[PDB]
Amino acid sequence: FQSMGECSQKGPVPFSHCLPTEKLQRCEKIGEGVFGEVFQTIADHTPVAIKIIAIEGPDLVNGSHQKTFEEILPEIIISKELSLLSGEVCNRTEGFIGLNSVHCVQGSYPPLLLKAWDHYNSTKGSANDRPDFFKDDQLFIVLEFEFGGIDLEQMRTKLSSLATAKSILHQLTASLAVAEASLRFEHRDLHWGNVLLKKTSLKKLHYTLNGKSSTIPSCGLQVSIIDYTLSRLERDGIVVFCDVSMDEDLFTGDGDYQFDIYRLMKKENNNRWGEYHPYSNVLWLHYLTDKMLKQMTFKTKCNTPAMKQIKRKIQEFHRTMLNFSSATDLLCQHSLFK
Ligand SMILES: Nc1ncnc2c1c(Cl)cn2[C@@H]1O[C@H](CO)[C@@H](O)[C@H]1O
């Protein structure tokens, strides 16, 4: 059965099942990675994001081998578990992205998606191969997500002030804490492409951690965490994760603190990726705080002592947070969030 038993179709479906004519025609490419492609479209007046990953074939795609179904299952499972936290009671958060559906699709790549791919290449430039070489027996996983807004990297020059950065860090820490508490979750790849920002009219956002509800001032933005390709969690003691113990390349990057975080995770976990080490979530939050202070540039600087104090408190968070054991420890004990 398709979509984890929430679609009545059995066996692979064509692209047109997921992308009927008007939905396909409205696709625009919004992102990419070695994994594949991300398109935005609209259905029932509501934007969605469609992540398309080739699986099970022998061709290199963007320079790498395609995952098998067994290899892609963890991202599918984790996407669903994290989405479901929006509807839970004891441990509840909307800070992970909604998952609408997941399909296994068979076919060559739609010409209309190639048109969108071309437009992105012509305007932004792509690091990927044009995905025009797939045959009619090719399998894909198509994940349809809630549209989460714009990634923090693309918002480098677009945020109002460091007050907004504080909200963003609080939202991220709370979401991670709730997922720790519910699922013994580690994201493991929370670079600034994976933090999405969308406008909200809500003044406060709500979460529940181990039965205790609280709120976070939004500063007009709702944060969504995406991309569970490297993530880990467990349910009733059964662990789902990406075993990267034998990966060379993941640990040899340079030129950004991001690449150090991979090495620092490996140090923390002794290269045993099945274990639960929620300190990895602290390391990613440190990397994001570091981006907030060193790479983000804000429309309004910290011009008054009250704004300079927010800046100082974020600097203080940066210099103290590595002494906390988990996002839960940070949320519950760090002075930034009191
Ligand atoms: N649900 C989303 N809503 C909005 N943008 C999204 C997504 C996803 Cl998933 C990915 N992206 C974009 O694609 C890139 C590669 O994954 C990300 O960095 C986002 O820009």
Ligand SMILES: [Co+2]
């Ligand atoms: Co379906």
Ligand code: NA
């Ligand atoms: Na969200």
